[PDB]
Amino acid sequence: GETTDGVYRVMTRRLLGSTQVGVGVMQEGVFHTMWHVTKGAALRSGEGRLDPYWGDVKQDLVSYCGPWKLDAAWDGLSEVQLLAVPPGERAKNIQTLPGIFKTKDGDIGAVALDYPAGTSGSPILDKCGRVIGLYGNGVVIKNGSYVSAITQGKRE
Amino acid sequence: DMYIERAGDITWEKDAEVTGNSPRLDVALDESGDFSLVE
Ligand SMILES: Cc1ncc(-c2ccccc2C(=O)Nc2cnn(C)c2)cn1
Numbered sequence: 071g072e073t074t075d076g077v078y079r080v081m082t083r084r085l086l087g088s089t090q091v092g093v094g095v096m097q098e099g100v101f102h103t104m105w106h107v108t109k110g111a112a113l114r115s116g117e118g119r120l121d122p123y124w125g126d127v128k129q130d131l132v133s134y135c136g137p138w139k140l141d142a143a144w145d146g147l148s149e150v151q152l153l154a155v156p157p158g159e160r161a162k163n164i165q166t167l168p169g170i171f172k173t174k175d176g177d178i179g180a181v182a183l184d185y186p187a188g189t190s191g192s193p194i195l196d197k198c199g200r201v202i203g204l205y206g207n208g209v210v211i212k213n214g215s216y217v218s219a220i221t222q223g224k225r226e
Numbered sequence: 227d228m229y230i231e232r233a234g235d236i237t238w239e240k241d242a243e244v245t246g247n248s249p250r251l252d253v254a255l256d257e258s259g260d261f262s263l264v265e
């Protein structure tokens with residue numbers, strides 16, 4: 071089925087009606103999402119099947135049809151844009167200056183924008199439109215609000 | 227069976243709604259890929 075670059079919804083019919091469980095990025099013939107969206111299952115595009123190629127539950131990432139392609143990195147300074155794709159709603163750019171997740175293994179960009187869980191996998195962009203990571207894995211804070219890592223894979 | 231549907235091009239958009247704060251947070255990442263607040 072459809073192999074054009076861009077952002078895609080990930081849907082299921084296993085619940086009431088058609089339910090958006092998350093979002094992904096198609097780049098260079100590879101579909102990129104978060105592991106918690108698909109749990110590593112195969113996907114349909116039209117009549118075509120997308121098989122998992124690479125994944126890691128700890129990174130919470132998965133690639134379909136080929137290896138992880140997205141290698142751009144937050145500069146640690148500039149604003150970025152969440153291309154939010156919320157359930158039933160149009161793709162919308164939201165621009166923000168990321169905070170920082172401080173961990174024992176290093177600092178990671180973080181985005182403090184509140185969307186339903188079905189938005190998991192929406193791409194985060196730099197100023198040149200490069201995907202610097204995916205939205206949807208992070209933490210609930212004092213306020214009850216959600217703060218997502220900028221989760222990026224490695225390209226070999 | 228999960229299926230995908232195209233939702234857009236991946237583009238920077240000038241005069242996108244500029245919102246959100248920039249919190250600095252001490253976090254831990256467990257073997258299950260769940261972040262937690264370290265306090
Ligand atoms: C109570 C609550 N927790 C989180 C979320 C949420 C909000 C925005 C994006 C993503 C998620 C989300 O669910 N992320 C996530 C990662 N791993 N798993 C299992 C689930 C909304 N509500």
Ligand SMILES: [Cl-]
Nearest residue numbers: 172173174252
């Ligand atoms: Cl730390």
